[PDB]
Each structure stands twice: as structure tokens, then as C-alpha cells.
Amino acid sequence: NLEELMRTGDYAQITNMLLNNQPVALVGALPFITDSSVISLVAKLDATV
Amino acid sequence: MDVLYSLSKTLKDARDKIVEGTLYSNVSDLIQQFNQMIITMNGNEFQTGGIGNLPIRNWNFDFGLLGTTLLNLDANYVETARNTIDYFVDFVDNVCMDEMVRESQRNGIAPQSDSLRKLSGIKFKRINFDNSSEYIENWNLQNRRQRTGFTFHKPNIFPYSASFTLNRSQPAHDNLMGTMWLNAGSEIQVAGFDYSCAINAPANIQQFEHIVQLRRVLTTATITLLPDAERFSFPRVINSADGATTWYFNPVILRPNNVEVEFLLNGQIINTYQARFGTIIARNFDTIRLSFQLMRPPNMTPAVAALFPNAQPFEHHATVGLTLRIESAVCESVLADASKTMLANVTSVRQEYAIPVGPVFPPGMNWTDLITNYSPSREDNLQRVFTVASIRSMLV
Amino acid sequence: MDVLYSLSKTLKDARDKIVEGTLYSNVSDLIQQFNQMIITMNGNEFQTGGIGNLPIRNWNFDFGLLGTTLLNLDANYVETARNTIDYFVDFVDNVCMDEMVRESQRNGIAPQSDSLRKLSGIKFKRINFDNSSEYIENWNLQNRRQRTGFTFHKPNIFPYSASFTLNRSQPAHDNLMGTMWLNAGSEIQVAGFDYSCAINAPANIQQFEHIVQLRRVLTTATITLLPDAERFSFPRVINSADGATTWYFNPVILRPNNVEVEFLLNGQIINTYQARFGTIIARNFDTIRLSFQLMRPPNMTPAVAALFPNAQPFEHHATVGLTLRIESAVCESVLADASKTMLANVTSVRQEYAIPVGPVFPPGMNWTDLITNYSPSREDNLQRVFTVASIRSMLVK
Amino acid sequence: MDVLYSLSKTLKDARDKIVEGTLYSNVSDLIQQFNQMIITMNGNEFQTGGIGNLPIRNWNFDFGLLGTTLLNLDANYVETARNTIDYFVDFVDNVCMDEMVRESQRNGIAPQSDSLRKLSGIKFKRINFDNSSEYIENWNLQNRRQRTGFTFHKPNIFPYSASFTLNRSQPAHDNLMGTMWLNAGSEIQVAGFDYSCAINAPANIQQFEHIVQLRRVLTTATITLLPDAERFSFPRVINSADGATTWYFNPVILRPNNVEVEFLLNGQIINTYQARFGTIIARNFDTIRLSFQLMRPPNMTPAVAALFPNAQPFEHHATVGLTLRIESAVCESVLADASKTMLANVTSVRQEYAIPVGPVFPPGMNWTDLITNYSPSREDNLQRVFTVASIRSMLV
Amino acid sequence: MDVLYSLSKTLKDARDKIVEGTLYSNVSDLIQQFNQMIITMNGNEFQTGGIGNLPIRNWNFDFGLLGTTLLNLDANYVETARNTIDYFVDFVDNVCMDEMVRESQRNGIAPQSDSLRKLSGIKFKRINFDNSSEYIENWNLQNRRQRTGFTFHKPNIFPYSASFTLNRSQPAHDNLMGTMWLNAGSEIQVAGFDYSCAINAPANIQQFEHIVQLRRVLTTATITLLPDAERFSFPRVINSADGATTWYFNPVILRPNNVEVEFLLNGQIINTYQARFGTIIARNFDTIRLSFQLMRPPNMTPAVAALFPNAQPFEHHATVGLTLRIESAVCESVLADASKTMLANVTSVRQEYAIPVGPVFPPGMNWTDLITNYSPSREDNLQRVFTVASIRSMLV
Amino acid sequence: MDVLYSLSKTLKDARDKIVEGTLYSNVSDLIQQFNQMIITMNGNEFQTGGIGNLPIRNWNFDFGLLGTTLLNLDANYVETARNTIDYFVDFVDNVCMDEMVRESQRNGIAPQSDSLRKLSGIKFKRINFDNSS
Ligand SMILES: [Cl-]
Ligand SMILES: [Zn+2]
Ligand SMILES: [Zn+2]
Ligand SMILES: [Zn+2]
Ligand SMILES: [Zn+2]
Ligand SMILES: [Zn+2]
Ligand SMILES: [Zn+2]
């Protein structure tokens, strides 16, 4: 839960999962970028955010 | 093993300390250790079972960390923690059961289950913390080749054996001299009998000797000596040595004479007790030598003299007993005892899931056969399963 | 209960850890727990003991907090802490004694004394901290209705019973066949006797059976089985069943034949041991069946043959024994055992203050009566009083 | 003692908790206590031994502190800690052994070895921390003059004594009335015998009494009482009281009548049980009175009537037995029991180094002599050495 | 179980309260609970199992919420609600049936069907609301370790048994003294018969005693006691104990004498009624002891004196009877009774789908075998299935 | 014991040395010790027990200091000192009697009566002075 992560300030679990490439689901109202570029998909820019 | 023990102890501390209304300061270190365990275990896939009737179970860890409270824990915190604790406890119990049912002739001290083998990896060493139980302490010492010590109340050191030896006998079994003994658990009960009551023995003394070779060295042992062996003080019909015939025993009990208990280590006399009964201390020994004598009473009342004629037939047979009871001791190796449940736990787990007989332990984990042939490989495997059994006992 | 246990645990930790010269870092969490206890108990009145000879004690709490500015504990700090600890320990002892002497037919697991009832309020739940003792852990598991477990060394599971059964008899009591047993504590000594030594038996085999029904299920039980029963291997003069006369028992011990120990749960075979002696494991059972045979030795030496004639009179009577000893076991219910003092403590407190017989427990806390009729209400009350006894033993003992 | 126990406890916690991969949060307080111990012990010279064959050993303490900036402990930290831990453990073991082998009459509670006397200084109290063990807890209670308590499983309270008394006797020993008993550890087997089967008794009843005085008061005692004394239920030839001759005992067992076991404190009846067998509770007592009766069976079958004639000879002798076993108890004084090992440890240390017999304890640390004459000075010295033995058992 | 009951109660309330023309204020909270249930169940896949002939069924939930903005409910609202209610009722009924046909030995109180196990998850705890029915209330109280009881009208506590005991008998069965009884359901009929009419009995009184040991403790029990057992008051031809022959019974009914009915708990007399008939109250008991006496009438008219001669043949046999009917009671455990339909529902569901015999219940859910061996595992499974059966009865 | 002995010694010295007409230089150190004893004992409540027929006695200490500033002790000084000394001597005698009648099998060298156990605290160590007997 991104709200709980924001409120606690403890980023140990999220940091450990992102460093170790552990599949996760971040839940919360999020703005998103609509990308229509196929080259962006090939470049895998969605995994760099 | 250390990581599995640490998981179990973290879960035990979580169950004991994470209780409603407790100050967060009473659990701060415990909560940090628990969250470290959650971080280390998350994302790891484990499998247990697949042996006998133990079901195959797959374990996944996708738990969030335990939170914090300003002053005291509330009910919500306890329930949220208890869900995770329950899952982890189920996992730990299953891992312990998987490890307890396995054995190896080669490297019997090493983990045998896939889950415990995975838990021995470097990544999980983070979970390791306080190792204060007796079994885990001895495990760590043994891994370092340090002197181990297990304290047993009434150690199960003597394999069951009810046997006799006839030093003088003949096919009619009416004039017999010998010894009959029971070595069961932590108890020795020996009795030397002479049918002629040492009428023709030199100086009217008949010497009886019993030797018990302990399969492991016992140290700091408290032992109770009693003059009489009640188990062999009543008349009984005993099979022959070859089972062809039965003979008759009709004890009349006399005080054992010149009693001598020698506790020996590697053939060297360590402790000697002469005509001493009650509590004695055997500091370090692997052999017990009980030497006693039937001394014919030089003076007898008419009733007593009636029982012991100058010649045959002998109807009342003079018996001198001796009872030895190891109340407590210390052994460098693991043994069954009346105070612990490790053997019972391992045997129960093996019986419940119908584990086929392996190449290390005897069928059914029978203690008599196990202690009779207590090989170093058997010792390693039994220490491993006993340590896992204690780890499981922390939670189950 | 958890609040009372937490009080006792805090006081024991204070006695053990608040010592002169110790680093404040060794006790900081303990000092916080102690001050939490002081704050929670301050301003509260308690009353303990209006049953039997137990005196009415009134308890007031107005104590200052322990300091936290020190780096190493000194003498004066320890003495003030000891004064507060002594008062609190006396209060906890009296509360435990008051709770141990009371029983309820309805909610025996619930608190009975008014002091423990008051401690069961929300405001005192703050005192609750580490519940690590075996009895309190089992209490908490049972409250949530999880699988409880109590480990007993030599569990007292068999009520005392020294009796006999005659399968063959007649008024002269000179040709008897039957069994005599003692079931006491954790021990069963049984012995089957035949006065004729199975001379006219079907193939010279006499079958003896003994069924012992435990009042609670035992798990993970280590059991020693020995072939002989020394208790029934000497001459005896035994009253008849009606007490009209006395008969003579002159046993000669023969080894038992086809020994079979069966450990059953709900009339279903869990464990079976055949001709096995020494240490055995009964993993889960509530009934024991010992079946053993007296087999006439086909070949006898002249003395043995003289023992057993072809017909009466039978001067020597063949006997085959068995001894069973539960060394250790696990039971989901509380029990008296050789190692613990819970039953002894409860009985001692009840006798000391002359507590009248209640509607739950037998007249005098007699364990044979209790285990003979170990009802669920008796189980609840016994678990409650045993847990309180352990809590008290943490401090008073 | 408190300082020595604190040293041992700190070392044991260092062994258990300073392990590879553990969070520094799990050991921070322990590391602080360990460094405090190093600081307090540094610059101090100690000397142990010099008694019996215990070698003289000199101990110097110049050690560096452990690090405190780690997040998780690694191999280097563990080895650095373990060197100091090994030296300190050896020092503590030697101090404990030196203290266990010494005794004083007037002030036996106070430290005897020079090392422990030096450790009893004010400056060493900084080492002092958690005193949670039962023996150190009782030591601190005794030092504060509070009520003390030790729980014993099967307390060894009865010195060994197999004796008899003949209330009716003749030189031929054919019409004997009396009682024979064994008191051993936590066991009392008594058996009253009448050779005439109380045919001439007033009401055909023979009254037997046995009073056993305990050398210390036992409280919260759980006892098992059984109606037969197997020890005296078989035929035996027994020496005479003066040893001049021997007599014949041929028991036939009848159930005891009007059994009454009384537990007394200072001559006042605290507990009483009539015709009660199984588990009983003696809440507080120092004496046991077992009074039983042999009642002649008014109705006898022809065999039973054949056993007991109207007059001599009496070939079958009526016997009624009682068995009393203290399974658990609480005593304000230290005692040897089946579950603990302090007596064994002290005796082993005294034996291994050939400690000359002192002015307090009996030779060889024999328990029967010690408990027979359990004087206050002996109690002081025994409590001291038992506490030292427990402290040593924490490490060795 | 709480979530399943909440689903059933929500559906029952929806059926009862969502009716055309009703004010929305009459259903506002009900509609809120129904929408909460829809939200919690939406997106979840469920499977009700294929045990026996019960078909495998799959359940999906993608329902929309109900309106909340009308002043009064109309036909469209009722139809829209009914479309969802039918599906939810079918799902709940199938889950209840799947749970009712399953049993376990280790944990019979825990859910057995995978659907109910899924519903026991935290995510479904939102569905839980008012738990007011007796069975769910008892379930919740028993999960809280709180004293709770079920009230039964004519409890089925006595296993069926029509038997007799002959204290005096002979191969010809013409002078018999004994007792006959039927213990069936909530009813006990007993009758002591003497063929000689106590002609040669001490004081011309024959004592009969009948003990019925209840398998569970009953409390606040209203009981009708009547002085005659009509079941054993007419001529009968009765098989012998071994079935070898048949004997003749020709009762002549006399008033029972010294009628003492004791209701005992743990062997202690809780309630006693002497010569009392009609309504009596047994407040708490587990055993019923009926003692009565056949008293030979001291004075007999010539017709009466002809029935009871001084010796054989005895053609009229004097019988005294008692009848004990438990009209109402309270039991900690669940029981079959004449008022409730739990046993009937469970048996019907198990019979209709050919559920094989399991390891807990007897074949066909036979109540006599069930209550004869009412083991704790049987009690747990029976309470579980009975609660599920009540939940289903709320809808089916 | 050393505190009790010091109380007795101070009282005996006061009785022997605080006499009418004596130079203050003959008692200066004695007066200092006596005032130290008064300060240490002031505000402390003692109880001599009721073992046997020994009466239960309660002792309260609220005494002014002995004066300085006299060249030779006069009668008023000696009277005030005698009042204080009489009360203190009664207390010390009762404490000694209470201690003399008690015993313990173990730790019999330690104080038995509550008064002497209280006197064994650190705060009373100030009273301790010359131990010459
Ligand atoms: Cl034991
Ligand atoms: Zn032979
Ligand atoms: Zn034991
Ligand atoms: Zn009989
Ligand atoms: Zn003699
Ligand atoms: Zn009706
Ligand atoms: Zn018949």
C-alpha cells in the first residue's frame, strides 16, 4: 500500500524488493504516462520508473 | 539448523511477547528480528514432504512487516501479527517434520531435507540470532569440535537385557551357581545365586561379578546403590540357556558381602565404592563392575540352618542382590531419558506418516537396537533429529 | 490471568535484574515495564480473601516511579525498588492464594476472586507483557482454542486401584485363575495367575487380558515395559471379592508368553508392540490393552515338574507379570506429575486456610477422586488453579 | 558469588547470542554488558588453585573492547569475541573449581578462594547483571535474609539405613514380632512382621509404628503411598542385632490395617491420611509417622488356615508393608536430588584433584554422612559450593 | 462458520424484508449489509466439491449492488433483488451441503470444505454480522471459551437399549429375580421383578437398583417420574441372555417401595427425590440412580394371597416399575431432540448423495451408535455439521 | 554491632566526661561525636520487640544538639545532656536486651533484632567511632 509506505516512511521492504527484483504490486491512486511509442516498449522504459 | 532454530525461537518469542496491551518497548528488538526474518524469507519458495505419507506442501512468503505503536500494542496489531506467526509456525513445523523423518549413512549431521538445505544458504544467515537452548548449544559446540554436554535424568543408557549366566550347572539344574541380571534403561539389577550356599566354597565365600559396558561415557553421574535386587528375590521358573528345558529358582536373600562398585574409564578404575549404599557419584566412566560375595553365615539359628544342609537336595538357594540406579548423568552424546520427549517426538512423527525403514536407524526407532549398535553415524543422525525435534517442540 | 501472570513476571524480572552495579541498559525495558505497572496499579484498591481462614487483606497502591537518569544501578535505587517489589509480591501472593481456593461449576476457567476479576478490566491490560511460561502459554492457546500441550514426567494418570479378577474360582480358593493389578500414578503392574499352570488348558496356554482406560488422551509418551510384576510375586493372603473369607496366593513366576501391548484411541489401534520390552513410544492413545499368555513349559527339570502336578492340590501357582511405566508424556489437559508442584501447592493452600469443600473438587483435593471423575468443569477449574499456582510459584517459591 | 554468576551469565549469553549474521540490535545490550565486564576486569591479576592437585594458575586481563558499529555480525567479529570469551570462560571455570574445593566452619557461606574474595569487592559490582537462575536467586534471597526455596524432584532427604527392631524376640528367633525398614533418598519402605500372626494379640491385632525424622523441613511435598513393601516381601536370612547369629524371615503378605500416615511439624500434626493410598500432599512437615496394623483374617480358607497354626512352629510369618515415595518437595535448604547435578559436580571436582578431607564435609563428599549430620555450618558450605557448581555448569 | 451464517442470515432477511411497497427505511441497514456482502463476494471463484454423488459446482460473483434511493420498494426492485438472492441462496445451500457431508478426526470443528475454508479468510470477515441464532451463538461462545449450552425438549441422550439383568435365575426360568429396562431417547422405563414375591427375602423386601450413566452432563432438567413401567407390565416371552431358550414373564404390578431417584455428578449426589412423583428438577447431573423395593404386602385379601404362594410354582410374578421422562434439559454439547431437525437434516443430506462412511460418524448417521461412543472428535464434527445444518435450514 | 557499640561508648563517655565545671576542651571531640549521634538518630523510629515477656517499646528521636561556646560546663548544660543521655541509654539498653534474647541456626553472627538490623544500615555508619574494647 503506497499510502501506508508514505505514512510510515519505512522503505526497507520496498527497497529490498526493488533491489532483488522481487515481483510486487504497488497499490494506490497513481498518475501514469500514456506511451504510444513501440520503441519505448522495446527500450523497456516502463521498468525504469 | 541454526537458521531453523532461529526461525522457531523468533516465532516462539512473537507468540509469547506480542500480546495485547504490551509496551512496544517490550517487543522492539523482537519486532526488528521478526521483520528481518520476514524480509529474508519473502520471495523464497520452499517445499516439504514427499516421504512416506508426509504430504507435499509448497510454501510462499509474501508478508508485510509488522508495524509500530507509540506506547502499547492493541488487538488489531496482535491479530495481524498472529496471521503471519501462524503461517510461519506451520512452515517451521512442516520443515522440522520433513527433517526428522530422514537419515543418511554419509554425512548424517548435515541437513537431509530440501527446505533445511536451502535454509543453510548464506542469504538466510541474517535470520540467525540467540542460540540458548541446550540442544542448539551442543549443536554449535559439536560443529566447532568443542566438548558437548547433555544432562539426562535417568538416562536410557542400558539396552534391555534380562539374562543369566551359570558358572556351575548340570542337566538337572538342582545345584546351580551363577548370576542373573536385568539391564533396563538407567537401572541395573543383578543377583548372584548359589544353591549350596557356599558350603564347599573356599572360606565359605562365593564371589559374583557383573560387568556392564556402557555404549557412551557418562560423566557427573549420580547413582543409587541398594543391597537387594527385588526383581530376583521370588521363586521363578527360568528357561534353559538353549531353551530346551526349564529350571527352578527359589531365592532366599542374604546380605551381599564385600560389595564393590568400580566405575572404570577405558579400562582404568576412576571411582571405587566399598560397602557403600545410597547416593554415590561416578565422575567419569564407561564401564560398571559390580563385585559382591555370598558369605555363608558362620552362626545360624535352627530355622536358618534348616535351609542350608551340608549336601543336596538344595531347596532354598542363597541369593545376594544388588540394585544400581543412574538418577542423573551427563553424556557427550544424545540419549533418551525419562525427562525429555525427543525420542518420543521423532518416533511419533515417523509412525504417524509411516516412514519406511531407512539405512541408519532400526525399524520403528526401537531404542534397544539403536543404543546396542550406537555407531557414530547413528549418533550424528540421532543428534540431528533430536535437535530438530526440540526446535519443533518450541512451537508444537 | 494474563495480567496476574504479567505482574508476577515483572516482579520476578525486577528481583533478578535490578541489582546493584548493573548497567541501566540491562534493565531499561524492564524499568519501563515496571513503571507501566506502577502507573496502572496506582490509585486502585484491592481486597483479597474472605473464604476459610484466609484473612481479609486490603491493598492500596501509591508508589513513585523508578528513576531513569542513572547509568549504573546503585544501592539506594535497588533498595527503593526492593521495597516496592516486596509490597507488589505480597499483593500478588495474596491474590494468587485467593484465586486458588475458589471454584465454580459454571465458568471455572473464568476468574473467581474479586481481585482477579478487577485485574480482568481493560485498564489493567496495559500491564500485560511477555507470556513465555509453559502454563501461561497453554492458557493463552486454550483461550483461543488452539491445540494445547502439557509435558509431564511420570504423569499421574491412573487413579489408585489395587484389585483382582477371578475368571476361575470356587469357595475353597485352591484352584484359581485370574489377574491382579495395581494401577497407581504412572505405573501399571499386572499379573495373571493360574493355580493349575494350564495343565488342562487348550494347548497349555492361558490367556490374560488387562484393559486400562485413561481419563485423558496421552500423546508422545515414552513407556517402559518390563516382563515381570514384582508387586504380585510373593506369598499373599487376599480378601475375597465379598470380604467373606481370605484366600492364599503362592506365586511362582514364569516369563509371560506372547506379550502384546496395544495403545488405542477411540477403540482404534494406534500402536502395537509384540514381545518388545524396554522403551517404547505410544504416540497417541487413551486406552491400554495388555494381553499376555501363561504357557506351560513343555520340558521341566525334576524340581520344576515337582512344582506343577497333574491335579490338585496346587501348592505353587504359576504367575506371569507385566510392568508398565509412563516415564514422560504430553497431555492436552493439566495433570499431576512427579516433577511439578502445582497440585501440591493448591492442596497446601487449601489445607492451610481450611477451605471448605466446594461443589467442584473432591473433599480435600484428593487426586484419585479428581482423576477418576475428571469432568470438563473439573478440568477448567483445575487448569485455572494450576496456572495461578505456577504464577505464585514464580514469586512465593 | 553474584559477580561470579554475572561473569558466567555474560559469557554464556555471549556464546549464545554473538553468532554470525545476527542483527546488532539482538546483541547491543549484551555487547554493552560484555564491554563493561572487560573494562571492570582489565588490569586485575587473579590466582587460582594451590589446593590438592588443582594447579596454580595466574590470570591477567588486558583485553580490547568489542566493536559496536556493525549491522549484522560476521566471522571476524565472532572470532574476536570468541578469543576473549574462551579466556574468560577458562578463568570462571578455574575460579569455580577453586571455590568448590574449599570449606570453612564459622563463615562457610562467605567466599573461601582468594579469587572470589577479590571479586567480592565493590569495584567489581559493575559486572553484576541479571540473576535469574534458581540457585543464584536463592543465594540473593539468603543474603537479604528472605525466605528461600528449592524445588527437588525426589529429594535425597533420607540417609541410607536398612535396619530392623524386634519388639518380641528369643535367642532362637522363631517367634519374632517387629518391623524392618529401608530409608533411602526419597523412599521409605517399612514392613511390620508377626511370626504368630497376632493369634495371642488382644483383639487379634498387632500395631506397628515407624517414625522417620527429616533433618530439614519439607513443604509442598507430593508423596505416593502404597500398601506393600516389596523390599521385605521375600524370604531372607538377616543378621542378628549384635551380629552374633542370623535369623530366618519368611514373609506372607497381608494388606495393612488401619493405615495412618501423619506428617508432623515440631510435634504438631500438620497432615493426616487414614486408609488413603496413591498421591497425597504434605504441605509442611519435618517428621513422618506411619502407623499400621496386622489384623488376623477372622475367616480363612483351608490353605490360609494351614498357614497360621495356633502355636509354634510358625513357618509362615505374617507381614504388612507400607511404601512412601516423595516425588517432589520444596525445602528452604539445599539437598541432592535425582534431577540436579550439583552434588555430582562438587564430588567430581573434589575427586579429580584429590582434595584432602576438610573440617566441614565428610570424606569423599559422601551424601549419607552429610545428610545424617546436616549442621548449619555444613548447610552454609553446601549452599556455597552448590551455587558455585551451578555457575560452573552454565559454562562447562 | 460465522461468515456462512452471516451469508445465510443476510439472504433470509433479504427474502423476508425486500417486499413490494415496503418503506426503504425498513430495509436500509439490510440493504447496506447485502451490498457489503456483494462487494466482498464479487470477483471470487468458489467450488463445491464432488464428494459422494454431490455434483461439483462452480460459483462466480459479478453482481451489481441494490438500489438505495427509493422511498418505497417497487416490483422492479424486488425482481432485481430476487435475481441475486436466488443465486446467493443456491451457493450458500451448496456450501452447507458440502460441509455437512465431510468429517475429520484431527480437527473436526474446523471447516472441511474448501469453500468454507476460503470463506474463513480475513477478506470475507466483512460479511460477518448479527449472530443471534442459538447454534451460531453457542459456536461463538465456545470459540471464546465461554460457558454456553443448548436447550433440548425431550433430549435424545439415552442410547436405545432394551435389556434385562437376572440376579437370580435357573435353567428352567421359573424363579427369577432381576430387572428389565428400556432406555430410549429421553425416556427410561425400568421394572424389577421377583417371581417369589420376596417370600424368603430379609424383611420381605427385594431391592432393585438401576444406574444410567449419561454420556454428557445435563443441567436444569425437567423430569417426569411415574411409579409404573407400562412397557414391562404385560405377559412376555423373552429370549435368554445367550438366546438358547425363551422364558415366560407374567407380571403383577405392585407399588414400588422406597423409591429413591438420585441425580449424581462426579459420583456425588446432586439431587435426591424420595417417594416423589410428577415433575422434578435435576439441576446438574451425569448419572441417574433409581433405587426401588418390592415389598411383600403384609396383609392380602384372599384373591391377592392366591397369587403369591409360599413356594413354587410361581405363576404370578411381582413387578415394581418406574418411568423417568426428560421433558427438557440443557447440555454443553449438541444432541438430537424431538423439537429440532439438525440430525434429520444431516442424515437426509448424507443419504441423498450416497456419502460413504467416514472415519468419525457411524454408517448412516445412526444416532444410537453415535451417542453410545460420543467421543470428543465425534462431538466436534457433530457440532460443526449441526451448525451448518441450522444455517442451511434458515434458507432451505 | 559496631554502631550499637559506638552508641554505648558515646553515651558512657558523655556520662563520664560531661560533668559540671569541666573545661570544654576536655569534651570538644566528645561533644562533636554526641552531636553527630544526635543528627544521625534524629527522625528515626525504632522498635524493640516483644519476644517473651520483653515489652514492646517504641523509640522516637527528636533532640537538640549539645551546645558549644562554654569555657567550663555549667549545671544547665549537664542537665540537658543528662536528659538526652538518659533517653539514649534507655534505648541502647533495650536494644541490647532485644538482641541478647534472639538466635538463628544459620547466620547467627548477623543481627537478629529489628533495631540492630536497622542500625546496620549505611546511614548509621556515621555514628561509628573508637572500638577499643
Ligand atoms: Cl523419577
Ligand atoms: Zn541351564
Ligand atoms: Zn524422575
Ligand atoms: Zn474369591
Ligand atoms: Zn536378634
Ligand atoms: Zn413435545
Ligand atoms: Zn436366562
Three-class HEC string of chain B: CHHHHHHHHHHHHHHHHCCCCCEHHHCHHHHHHHHHHHHHHCCCEEEECCCCCCCCEEEECCCCCCCCCCCECCHHHHHHHHHHHHHHHHHHHHHHHHHHCCCCCCCCCCCCCHHHHHHCCHHHHHHCCCCCCHHHHHHHHHHCCCCCCEEEECECCEEEEEEEEEEECCCCCCCCEEEEEEEEECEEEEEEEECCCCCCCHHHEEEEEEEEEEEEEEEEEEEEEECCCHHHCCCEEEECCCCCCEEEECEEEECCEEEEEEEEECCEEEEEEECCCEEEEEEEEEEEEEEEEEECCCCCCHHHHHHCCCCCCCCCEEEEEEEEEEEEEEECCCCCECCCCHHHHHHHHHHHCCCCCCCCCCHHHCHHHHHHCCCHHHHHHHHHHHHHHHHHHCCC
Question: CA-CA-CA-CA torsion for D229, D230, D231, D235, nearest 10 degrees?
Answer: 110
Q: Is the peptide bond before D155 cis (omega within 30 degrees of 0)?
A: no
For residue B64, count other CB atoms closer than 10 A to its CB.
Answer: 14
All cell numbers assigned to E27: 430495509
What pairing do the DSSP bridges indicate for beta strands C278-295 and C257-265? antiparallel
Instruction: Return the half-sphere exposure (C-beta side, CA atoms, 13 A cut-off) of residue B375.
Output: 14
Closest CA to B7 of B113, B111, B116: B116
Q: Is D26 helix (H, G, I), strand (E, B) or coil?
A: helix
Cα–Cα distance for residue pair C82/C15, rounded to 1 Å: 7
For residue E120, count other CB atoms closer than 10 A to its CB.
Answer: 15
Helix (H) or strand (E) holding D270: strand D268-274
| From D23, D160, D245, residue closest to B301, measured CB to CB | D245
Q: Whose grid coordinates read 560398571?
A: B288
Q: What is the largest CA-CA distance in chain E?
A: 93
For residue A15, count other CB atoms closer than 10 A to its CB.
Answer: 11
Instruction: Return the half-sphere exposure (C-beta side, CA atoms, 13 A cut-off) of residue B109.
Output: 15
Give the N- to C-terminal CA distance of chain E in Å, as an integer.
Answer: 17
Phi, psi at residue F122, to the nearest 5°? Answer: -65, -35
Distance C241 CA to ligand 7 centre (A): 24
Residues in chain D with CB shorter than 8 Å from the CB of F108 are 376
What pairing do the DSSP bridges indicate for beta strands B251-254 and B317-331? parallel
**Is C376 touching E (CB cutoff 8 A)?**
yes
- The DSSP result for C283-327, as a single string, is EEEEEEEEEEEEE--SSB-HHHHHHS-SSS---SEEEEEEEEEEE
- Among all bound ligands, the one having the nearest atom to the CA of C180 is 4
Quote the distance between the C-alpha of residue E235 and its chain's center: 32
Cα–Cα distance for residue pair E220/E151, rounded to 1 Å: 9
Specified resolution (Å): 2.7
Give the N- to C-terminal CA distance of chain D in Å, as an integer.
Answer: 17
Give the N- to C-terminal CA distance of chain F in Å, as an integer.
Answer: 13
All cell numbers assigned to D282: 504434605
Question: Exposure pattern of C211-248 as b/e (b: 16+ CB <10 Å)?
Answer: ebebbbbbbbbbbbbbbbbbbbbbbbbbebeeeebbbb
Q: Whose grid coordinates read 450458500?
A: E92
User: What subunits touch chain B, counting only 3 or more CB pairs under 8 A?
Assistant: A, C, D
Q: Whose grid coordinates read 557461606?
A: D109
Bridge partners, E247 (sequence order): E238
Residues in chain B with CB shorter than 8 Å from the CB of A12 are 35, 39, 65
Cα–Cα distance for residue pair C286/C293, rounded to 1 Å: 23
Q: Which of A16, A18, A27 to mutate to test the interface with B (most CBs of B within 10 A)?
A: A16
Residues in chain A with CB shorter than 8 Å from the CB of B43 are 17, 20, 22-23
Using CA coordinates, name the residue in chain C closest to E219. C106
All cell numbers assigned to B173: 539344574
* 3+ Cβ–Cβ pairs closer than 8 Å linking D and F: yes
Number of H helices, E strands in chain D: 9, 14
| 8 Å CB contact between C237 and D237 | no
All cell numbers assigned to E321: 416399575
| 8 Å CB contact between E200 and E314 | no
What pairing do the DSSP bridges indicate for beta strands D278-295 and E150-153? unpaired
Question: CA-CA-CA-CA torsion for C215, C221, C227, C233, nearest 10 degrees?
Answer: -40
Using CA coordinates, name the residue in chain E closest to C361. E266
Contact C376 E332 (CB under 8 A): yes
All cell numbers assigned to D89: 570462560
- DSSP-derived letter for residue C72 is B
- The DSSP result for C324-349, as a single string, is EEEEEEEESS---BSS--HHHHHHHH
F52: left (phi over 0), alpha (psi -120 to 50) or beta: left
Q: How far is B235 from chain D (nearest CA, A)?
A: 9
Residues in chain D with CB shorter than 8 Å from the CB of C347 are 281, 283
Cα–Cα distance for residue pair E42/E167, rounded to 1 Å: 70
Q: How far is CA B316 from CA B180, B257, B307, B313, D231, in A?
A: 17, 19, 6, 9, 19
Planar angle of CA D324, D325, D329, nearest 5 degrees: 125
Q: How far is CA B62 from CA A18, B18, B91, B136, C215, in A?
A: 14, 21, 13, 29, 44
Say what angle helices D75-100 and D28-41 make with each other, to 10 degrees. Answer: 50
Q: Whose grid coordinates read 453457542?
A: E138
